[PDB]
Amino acid sequence: QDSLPDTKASGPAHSKEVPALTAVETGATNPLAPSDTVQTRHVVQRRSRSESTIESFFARGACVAIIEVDNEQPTTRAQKLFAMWRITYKDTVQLRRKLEFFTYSRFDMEFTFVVTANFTNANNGHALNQVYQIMYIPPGAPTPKSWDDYTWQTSSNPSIFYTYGAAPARISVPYVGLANAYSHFYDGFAKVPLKTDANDQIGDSLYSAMTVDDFGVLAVRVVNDHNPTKVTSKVRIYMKPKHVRVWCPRPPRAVPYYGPGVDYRNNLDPLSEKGLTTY
């Protein structure tokens, strides 16, 4: 059982006990039930809060990134033969808002990858099935300059080899934070300006930002040598927090996000017009 408390039968009152009166100045919410202010019957309650538990609230795979990668003739100008994405829940808004009801969190993370592709041009022959390499590059590790250079050797970095058309790829990541919990909010700086500094840029930092690389990047490429005809592909990344714990509740975001911090820019008017005495 996990059902909510039953309603007690409550009758008329004429007393010095006054549950209906209080003083919110104290910081407290008045703990009242229907039977404190109206006559109630006995109700055997069967409803439960099973679906609003922290795990149940976040137990859903959310889209956090759309990485685009091309497979085509390596010409000689800025191309997309490989791509890189900094791992984050902040390029999207929906999961970001959910996680931000709380100041701190701690959880394991499940990543699922949906890969779609298509022919870019009207026609030059076709393409044999593609295998994709999704490589995780943790901070410090050599990042690729070329779609087939030595870093893709991946001897120590974890890589996924996904075959197009196969069931979407899936892996799990442990809790990997440098702290005891993930900070969804950090009121501070990574550096402090000191009176003895040479230029006053030595100590300059972004407000709220912590480490420069956060958690590293996912480097994505098509392992296939190019067909004559170009194939364009998109890798959609779905993120789900599992085995979740959260601390210190916060008011939800009420105005549109403006970048990785708490900054607002416009549409600062969230509430509609409604007359004071209008239902």
Binding site: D2, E17, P19, T26, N30, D108, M109, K242
Partner: protein
């Protein structure tokens, strides 16, 4: 290593307690599914952070 638990049965077929079985295949707990058997708690740390917590029928300020 099989783990067996009772399902909270919503719509009952016209046919009592029903169970489901779970086995972990991986050494790293991060790989595990979610148990979804979550215990709850009192809201008081939020709804009542008062040093002297008072009873609702008494005057809040005295």
């Amino acid at each position: 290593g099989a783990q067996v638990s009772s399902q909270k049965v919503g719509a009952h077929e016209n046919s009592s307690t029903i169970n489901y079985t779970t086995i972990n295949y991986y050494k790293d707990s991060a790989s595990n599914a979610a148990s979804k058997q979550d215990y709850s708690q009192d809201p008081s740390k939020f709804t009542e952070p008062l040093k002297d917590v008072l009873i609702k029928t008494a005057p809040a300020l005295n």
